[PDB]
């Protein structure tokens, strides 16, 4: 059967993908630590979400070795840009990103049809992480975002603080 | 006496009416829970008041039966619209709403002339809600909004968060 | 055009959800009116009055969960009229429960229907949700 | 033009409230006058100063209940001069004192007036408010 | 001596004055209670300061009666206007007002030269009230008052909410 | 050895420079207390940081007397301007300053090469003060600073209130 | 021109405060200087070290009380240079002591001067301040 | 051009930082690789799995300490690819349990080298930071 070698190939792509997002969210994070962006909360958000997607790839690697399979590590590609211009654009990307990262996670459940259903837990949390990202893109826009640097400052404070 | 069947008839209009508002209020709530709107505290506001107009119509049916009358339920008409445009518009509406809802709740008391004066507590409450409603429509207009999506955001947090 | 958060969510589902919403909403409305049959002195079963007000509120929350699901996956909520119960006077000993328990079928079935439609369109998120939101609504007696 | 919140609130009540605003305000002013007398050395009845300052802040509070009602039904508050009180024999043994009851009568009277005006115009809200507020305005002295 | 009648007549003009202050502030307060400028929190500001210039005139009449003098009560003239236009113009007036309230309070101390120095504790608190008024006027001006009605909202919340 | 006289000379330049830092942040501090400026939180900032650079000079003199050195005090010169224009331009000066105050604190360590490394602990916080200083300049410009004076009001409330 | 908040504040008072701000600050600079003479191993009077770091902090808070009055009355704070103390190597640390004597005197003096300039220009607020501030300042030194 | 917060930070130091940012990020990768090496049913050394997940996060935090120093001194963070755990041809018990020896060597070495460069460019803050970061790093491998 290719089912056992198709599915151990999927855990690896996701592991190298859920690790990628880890990188991007980290690159994003310290784009906001820098003095000429200086939105300490934007930093705190992604950096947490960066840990979340690290802890998420780490579960994939423990499911692999449980299911007998083997762990094929690939280069963690550097994100597409290291200057994310704006908060509104950093969100537009992490949205585009958790969506492409969620594209494959789906191909991983329709091809497993486990009785374990192990990952199904982290499939629900990625979806909670998408609506939150859309909600965050919408507010920035109406707030005459993104250019109004005022708008981003208040969102840093009143949305990424509580 | 037509008085026993007038009242039981004005009760059934109000029951279906105080029902409608709940529906209208539920529609508004999840018009803000949707990602192109994204004002959770708006969403939170109406879904409490929906429950409160619901709690208000549940009393009406317990009063009907307390009075021995009969409960003639009518269709809960779909609220006029499913997209409420802006926060400011949604408020202007439920102001139009709880005002027209009060109009017959007036026709109800004057046609009653009870010794029990039971709904007088809820008559006293439909009025606190209307003052608050204009109070919210006014703060919004002067905030340059709604053409200023910023405005609606800030109100979402500063007035609808405490 | 398209909502910025939509994924693997097929158009036949977005509609079927909105079907199940007006449904469950109808379910709150009959369950509601029902609690208030038993409450009339002609009946006087605070027990059975009591239980149907709760099943009204739980069915509405169900509606809520669904709505929050709709907007969660980027689909739009198009409400319809919550039709007045085609029932009118439920009444008698061991009564109208028949017309009552019934909807516990058509509600639950429309869900299992939704369950097969999700498997058809390979939407695993939708599947788990409905399975969580069928098991729950299970329990029939007393519940 | 019209305030966005008005409802079955007849222009006569709006003027009648505002007239009850200046009245309670005058009532506060006089009670104050009376109060700061019992304090003077020629009389030195701190018991009475005590009651008349307290009632001084309570008729002012009354006044505010009403203004908060005014802006609540949607009407506009027009304030007038608080006329000086006619009083001086602010002292004695069996006198002057009650000459203030004329106040408790005319105050409490203009209220019952406002109550019949509510009932003529069919504003059950204004009515239950005036009734609560007059009953609140209870009887005279206590221990 | 006219000094005994000088001072006891200054106490009265003042009693009639610090009373006026109370009245104006109370007029101001419920201008922000009404539905066309629903501010609430402003409203809490002045109505407390009306209490503070009432309890302040209440002390004046206790002193007159201690200093043997007499209490000559004059009309409480209606405030200059019963519409204040803008939170900005409410503050500006009370600055001007407390400024004219304080002018005479000076003519009251310079013409007293007591050993008791009674009112000198209330002369120090009307100055804390003057700096704080201009502090509220200044912030509102640079906010862009009034029109940007947006300004008066934020000031309402972030200045008067704490 | 000139070393004992170059280092005891470098201690005094700095004592007369971190003292000057104390004087600028005070002249800054009470330019915000004034009624036509009135940012109570801006004031609280420099009046605490001003305390931070007076405690900083008091350590220098105790180290001068510890290493046997002698304390040569100079005039504490009046700061460049006693009217700082804008919350943003005070931050640009205090930044421009803490960088020139740190320019010499460097020459003082490269010329020291202790086994004690006494002022090494204070070098690590003058750098925490600069990153922070730029972080606030950038939000201000950013916080769409300045012009719309409001910017500075929100920054006074939202960044400097917590 | 004029600040929106000034009253009965004469342009002389405005200037004599500012003289009083530079003074007190000069005091904090000398008292600071003194503490670290008693701190040097050549003197090793920690108690006198100790007493004079506290006199420095407190004559600086003084200056701040004064600045906050300036802006409180509506005048403008024009700061001058805090000159070095004429002192430097208090040989006999009694020279140190005699320095402060002529300091406590010139300070307390400029204050009492501010006191009669206030009586001159009929500014009862400025006067009560300087008085509290002088009484505060009095008190020899136990300790 | 230039960031508003840079001071005596030679561009040499800025480049040498971003190298150690990719280096210490690479190390998060290997230790992870190793860690889950021991978790496989074939090795079953939970203890070693556990310790390498610890050192994966603890060197990735290191990475952050660095980037945050970067943006502290005013320099710009440019990530590189986190190369795979080169892994010549290894994954059986008792294997390149080394690997990490040379890894810590090249990590701590590149650190120690960075110490010589601050000393050359007279950058005491960068030098003070790394001595701590290395001492922290030292002591560990065991027991």
Author numbering:
A (entry chain G), B (entry chain C), E (entry chain A), F (entry chain E): 10 to 171
C (entry chain D), D (entry chain B), G (entry chain F), H (entry chain H): 4 to 146
Paste lines from the article.
To this end, we made a mutant named Δ3C, where two cysteine residues (Cys90 and Cys102) related to the formation of the intra-subunit S–S and another free cysteine (Cys130) were replaced by alanine (Ala), respectively. In contrast, the smaller species was sedimented to obtain as s20,w = 7.20 S, which is nearly the same as that of NF-8 (s20,w = 7.4 S), suggesting that it is also a 8-mer protein assembly, and is termed as 8-merΔ3C. To determine the possible difference in structure between 8-merΔ3C and NF-8, the crystal structure of 8-merΔ3C was also resolved. Similar to NF-8, 8-merΔ3C also comprises eight of Hα- and Hβ-type subunits at a ratio of 1:1, which assemble into a bowl-like structure with an outer diameter of around 9 nm. The crystal structure of 8-merΔ3C is in good agreement with its structure in solution characterized by analytical ultracentrifugation and TEM. However, removal of the intra-subunit S–S bonds in NF-8 did not inhibit the formation of the Hα-type subunit in 8-merΔ3C, suggesting that the intra-subunit S–S bonds are not essential stabilizing forces for the structure of Hα. Although the structure of 8-merΔ3C is similar to that of NF-8, their packing pattern in the crystal is completely different from each other. For example, the side view of the crystal structure revealed that 8-merΔ3C molecules array in a repeating side-to-side pattern to form two-dimensional (2D) protein layers, where two adjacent bowl-like 8-merΔ3C molecules having opposite orientations are connected by two salt bridges. The formed 2D layers further arrange in the vertical direction to create 3D porous protein assemblies. Support for this idea comes from the observation that the melting point (Tm) of the 8-mer bowl-like NF-8 protein is about 76 °C, while its analog 8-merΔ3C’s Tm decreases to 73 °C due to a dearth of the intra-subunit S–S bond.
As a standard structural component among protein nanocages, ferritin exists ubiquitously in both prokaryotes and eukaryotes. It is a nearly spherical 24-subunits protein with an exterior diameter of about 12 nm and a hollow cavity of 8 nm. Structurally, the 8-mer protein is a heteropolymer that is composed of two different subunits (Hα and Hβ) that originate from the same polypeptide. We have described here a protein-engineering approach to convert the 8-mer protein assembly with C4 symmetry into the 16-mer, 24-mer, and 48-mer protein nanocages with higher symmetry by controlling the intra- or inter-subunit disulfide bond.
